[PDB]
Amino acid sequence: KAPSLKFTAPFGCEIYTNPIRAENCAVGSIPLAFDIPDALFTRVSETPT
Amino acid sequence: LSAAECTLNECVYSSDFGGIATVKYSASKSGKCAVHVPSGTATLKEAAV
């Protein structure tokens, strides 16, 4: 029994059991898309300047 | 008036009255009178302030 994947995983993952899953593997990057409606854009003079 | 200065707070060339100009003046008498733009550059909302 060469040690578990809990202790040997690259990027510092955190292997768990009941769903077989890894946690918090610091690798890659998430892109994001924001479809923002036009109602949220407050005008200039309703904010300090 | 005497020594009046005009700055543009909001400026958006929208179809409605979408621009705010705050005229910083210094008046000899305190009384209402009429503002106007001679050109077709801007169309003012109110006739007097």
Structure explained in plain terms:
- Chain A has one helix at 5-8.
- Chain A contains one helix and no strands.
- Helices cover 8% and strands 0% of the residues of chain A.
- The longest helix of chain A has 4 residues, at 5-8.
- The radius of gyration of chain A is 22 Å and the shape is rod-shaped.
What is the structure about, briefly put?
Chain A has 49 residues and is mostly loops.
How are the SSEs placed, and which strands pair?
The structure is cut from a larger assembly and holds 2 copies of chain A (49 residues).
Chain A: H1 5-8
Q: Estimate the helix proportion of chain A, in percent.
A: under 10%
Percent of residues in β-strands of chain A: under 5%
Question: Largest interface, counted with CB-CB under 8 A?
Answer: A-B, 4 and 3 residues
Subunit organisation of the chains: part of a larger assembly
What class do helices, strands and sheet pairing of chain A give? little secondary structure
Main sheet makeup of chain A: none
Q: Globular, elongated, flat, extended or rod-shaped: what is the shape of chain A?
A: rod-shaped
Q: What is the count of DSSP helices of chain A, taking H or I runs of 4+ residues?
A: 1
Jot down its keywords.
virus like particle/protein binding; 49 residues; part of a larger assembly; 2 chains
